[PDB]
C-alpha cells in the first residue's frame, strides 16, 4: 500500500480512501483521498 502524497505508477494501489490521482506537470500522480472514494469508504 501507499500513503498520501506518494507518487503513483505501476500496480501497487494506495490506502483507501487514498486513490492514485494526477497532478499536472507530474503524471506520476499521487495517492489522495478521492471524492468517489466515499462510495468505497475505506
UniProtKB/Swiss-Prot annotation:
Q: Matching InterPro entries, A to Z?
A: Delta-hexatoxin
Q: In which tissues is it expressed?
A: Expressed by the venom gland.
Question: What are its GO cellular component terms?
Answer: extracellular region
Keyword annotations for this protein, in alphabetical order, are: Disulfide bond, Ion channel impairing toxin, Knottin, Neurotoxin, Secreted, Toxin, Voltage-gated sodium channel impairing toxin
Task: Show the Gene3D superfamilies listed in the entry.
Answer: 4.10.40.10
Q: List the cysteine pairs that form cystine.
A: 1-15, 8-20, 14-31, 16-42
The answer to whether keyword Cytoplasm applies is no
The entry's family comment says: Belongs to the neurotoxin 06 (delta-actx) family.
Q: What is known of its domains?
A: The presence of a 'disulfide through disulfide knot' structurally defines this protein as a knottin.
Q: Briefly state the protein's biological role.
A: Inhibits tetrodotoxin-sensitive voltage-gated sodium channels (Nav) by binding to site 3. Slows the inactivation, and causes a prolongation of action potential duration resulting in repetitive firing in autonomic and motor nerve fibers. Does not depolarize the resting potential. Does not affect tetrodotoxin-resistant sodium channels. This lethal neurotoxin is active on both insect and mammalian voltage-gated sodium channels.
Q: What is this protein called?
A: Delta-hexatoxin-Hv1a
Amino acid at each position: 500500500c501507499a500513503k498520501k502524497r506518494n507518487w503513483c505508477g505501476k500496480t501497487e494501489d494506495c490506502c483507501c480512501p487514498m486513490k492514485c490521482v494526477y497532478a499536472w506537470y507530474n503524471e506520476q500522480g499521487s495517492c489522495q483521498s478521492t471524492i468517489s472514494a466515499l462510495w468505497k469508504k475505506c
